[PDB]
């Protein structure tokens, strides 16, 4: 049944394969990155504070998934080591997916990073509320999912200069987004809203080199983005940098176990995954334009 997801696999030692899949084994893909509901409940009972709870859960999950089995393998056996989703211009976007690429001059801790993520979540939600005015977005309960590329040669961080992150958040109902330009505009607005947050800048501004975080060129027909739970292929050696969840719990979360378990749902990190409604949409508003080519006010005035 179609539409289907088409992925681009990076074969070793060179070459690119393609895979159009009607269904897949996601339980096997996300297996060694899951926390038993009993463990989550016990930790929630232990630590009431949500920052501490999220850091504890992140530490627990980090020390669970050892490795995805690497080696040789043909395209059918490598689609479980590397996999990128290709943006299709004939479909609608139901998730806002941001590929953050921070650049540092001094290594950042992980508690500082968690605080910075908690601050980032606050401004992005305000930007989203401004962009989608007909939807009720609660800034202290809306779910946002954070993934951080693993560390290769409170969990410690051994990164060198760059901290790769992925942020996923559903488009508020009853809104849908159509177009590659529209998504670029949404990314622009999100980045501007985040960069204006005083708390986020104060918390993370010391270590960073530049304040250009969200790459807005990843939204183009045919371009591919790496999926969570998949590692980059290094021709030099083995796979590295798996994207694994970094739990940043909302302050007003009412179901912590559900939030934790929603990080392994493949529908939460795909561009055109079907929306998760409750009964049925009585009406949906498609945002099919957000202006156009942007340039800038400083550019128009100067010209």
């Amino acid at each position: 049944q179609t539409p289907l997801p088409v992925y681009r696999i990076s074969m070793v030692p060179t070459g690119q394969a393609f895979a159009a899949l009607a269904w897949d084994d996601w339980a096997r893909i996300t297996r060694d990155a899951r926390l038993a509901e009993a463990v989550v409940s016990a930790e929630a009972a232990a630590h009431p504070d949500h920052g501490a709870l999220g850091r504890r859960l992140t530490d627990r999950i980090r020390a669970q998934g050892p490795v995805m089995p690497p080696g040789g393998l043909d395209a059918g056996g490598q689609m479980y080591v590397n996999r990128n989703e290709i943006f299709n211009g004939a479909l609608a976007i139901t998730n806002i997916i941001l590929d953050l690429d921070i650049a540092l001059k001094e290594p950042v801790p992980f508690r500082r990073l968690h605080e910075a993520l908690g601050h980032f979540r606050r401004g992005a939600l305000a930007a989203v509320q401004l962009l989608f005015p007909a939807a009720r977005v609660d800034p202290d309960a809306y779910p946002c999912y954070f993934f951080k590329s693993a560390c290769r040669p409170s969990p410690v961080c051994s990164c060198t200069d760059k901290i790769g992150l992925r942020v996923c958040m559903p488009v508020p109902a009853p809104y849908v987004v159509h177009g590659s330009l529209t998504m670029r505009g949404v990314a622009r607005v999100i980045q501007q809203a985040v960069l204006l947050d005083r708390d986020f800048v104060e918390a993370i501004g010391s270590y960073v080199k530049n304040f250009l975080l969200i790459d807005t060129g990843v939204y183009a027909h045919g371009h591919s983005l790496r999926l969570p739970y998949f590692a980059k292929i290094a021709p030099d050696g083995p796979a590295c940098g798996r994207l694994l969840p970094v739990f940043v719990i909302p302050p007003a979360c009412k179901d912590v176990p559900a939030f934790v378990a929603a990080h392994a749902d493949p529908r939460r990190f795909h561009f055109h995954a079907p929306p998760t409604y409750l009964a049925s949409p009585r009406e949906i508003r498609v945002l099919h334009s957000l202006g156009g080519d942007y340039v800038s006010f400083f550019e128009r005035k100067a010209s």
């Binding site: 211009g89 004939a90 177009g179 498609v286 099919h288």
Partner: protein, 150 residues
């Protein structure tokens, strides 16, 4: 739409009446385009008839393999338009292939523009005649509705 507009004119109002008529016409066009989406996958509904005395798309080489289906073409040729790529917009002789057909998405934007031209002709004529308006009637399709098919 014309029935509604000419029935509104009976109540009588100044140029405000012309503005109301323009609004009604735009609403009618919007509803027509919205209802044309549910028939986006039907190829015989969007197929248009062509006479032997007009310019038509060249016959695809695969149309000559129909066999007994080419024995029923004597005057009219029904051609639909499909988009197999970026902007190809090729033409398909619907009646020269066995059924069911397996085609790419239909080019409903081009067909809808062709129909909207005729619709706007009538609406502009009505506006110019009943209320003396030099302003032509134009419907924004590429700005407000072209996303449903792209």
């Amino acid at each position: 739409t014309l029935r509604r507009v000419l029935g509104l004119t009976t109540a009588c109002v100044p140029e405000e009446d012309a503005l109301t008529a323009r609004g009604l016409m735009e609403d009618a066009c919007d509803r027509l385009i919205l209802d044309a989406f549910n028939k986006r996958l039907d190829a015989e509904y969007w197929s248009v008839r062509v006479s032997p005395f007009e310019a038509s798309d060249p016959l695809p080489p695969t149309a000559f393999r129909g066999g007994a289906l080419l024995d029923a073409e004597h005057y009219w040729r029904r051609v639909v338009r499909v988009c197999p790529g970026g902007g190809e917009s090729v033409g398909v002789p619907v009646d020269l292939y066995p059924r069911p057909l397996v085609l790419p998405p239909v080019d409903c934007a081009h067909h809808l523009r062709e129909i909207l031209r005729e619709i706007e002709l009538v609406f502009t004529g009505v506006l110019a005649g009943v209320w003396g308006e030099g302003g032509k009637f134009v419907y924004p399709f590429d700005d407000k509705m072209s996303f449903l098919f792209a």
